[PDB]
């Protein structure tokens, strides 16, 4: 989607505590319970994650029912990476 | 009739432009740099906003309509 990463970071936090959230298919309401991000953005952000795995896919009345997988949690541990020093070799030489 | 339209519009583009942050005045050894084009005094910017030079009108593109300095 064409939605910045700043609004994505919010969603992630509530998905670690839960991992199922819902949001009625009615656009422009501005806020969900919890997530303070519009109903255009959040619903379609879930869709983007959903298509890339992360989620077991059931439709069912007017919400689109997303249930995170174990793999899902790990995938979301790249947005909020874990406690944020995550390891391997990203610089290119000292100064000197 | 149905829906007819005249051509619709079809569109061009909003127009994506280079920033133009090439400008600066850079000195020789002891490379002090002074900054050409005025900065937004707003703390939130962390400014390098280098206000656009339009005919009797200058604004920072970060901050809305605001900071309209004609001179």
């Amino acid at each position: 989607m064409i939605i910045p990463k700043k609004n994505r970071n919010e969603i992630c936090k509530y998905l670690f505590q839960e991992g199922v959230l819902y949001a009625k298919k009615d656009y422009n309401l501005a806020k969900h319970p919890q997530i303070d991000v519009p109903n255009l953005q959040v619903i379609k952000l879930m869709q983007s994650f959903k298509s890339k795995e992360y989620v077991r896919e059931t439709f069912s009345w007017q919400y689109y029912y997303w249930y995170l997988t174990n793999d899902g949690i790990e995938h979301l541990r790249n947005y909020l990476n874990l406690p944020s020093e995550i390891v391997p070799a990203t610089l290119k030489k000292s100064a000197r | 009739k149905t829906y007819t339209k005249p051509k619709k519009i079809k569109h061009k583009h909003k127009k994506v432009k280079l920033a133009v942050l090439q400008f600066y005045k850079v000195d020789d050894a002891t490379g002090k740099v002074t900054r050409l084009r005025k900065e937004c005094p707003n703390n939130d910017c962390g400014a390098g906003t280098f206000m656009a030079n339009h005919f009797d009108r200058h604004y920072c593109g970060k901050c809305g309509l605001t900071y309209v300095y004609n001179q």
Binding site: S84, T90, L91, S94, A95 | D27, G46, A47
Partner: protein, 123 residues
């Protein structure tokens, strides 16, 4: 613990702040970071098209918030960083730039962080 090891205070410095999501990429964004207290490190290319842009950033690095690092060509530098998208097991990618980086966060202290910064300030 924590002084790094022999010849590993090189590439293991920026481990921390890639994960923090805080790496300010591109020369234009990098310049505004130095025009602010935010620059804890400054990383540049060498080989460039319009290397004139790099000179502007080096002028800012001469003034307060003083750091420099190098390694050449824009696209290769982004392999280390993140805009190389995998899409095959045997490390073959589109290989897009990232290039020139200015570093926020780190939030630990010690190790490679001190070592790199000290060199530029006092040679």
């Amino acid at each position: 613990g924590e002084p790094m090891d022999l010849m590993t205070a090189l590439q293991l410095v920026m481990k921390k702040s890639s994960a923090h999501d805080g790496l300010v990429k591109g020369l234009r964004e990098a310049a505004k970071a130095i025009e602010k207290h935010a620059a804890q490190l400054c990383v540049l290319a060498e080989d460039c098209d319009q290397p004139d842009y790099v000179k502007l950033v080096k002028a800012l690095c001469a003034e307060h918030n003083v750091h420099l690092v190098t390694v050449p060509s824009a696209k290769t530098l982004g392999e280390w960083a993140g805009l190389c998208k995998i899409d095959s097991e045997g490390k073959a990618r589109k290989v897009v730039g990232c290039s020139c980086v200015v570093v926020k966060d780190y939030g630990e202290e010690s190790e490679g962080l001190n070592i790199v910064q000290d060199y530029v300030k006092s040679h």
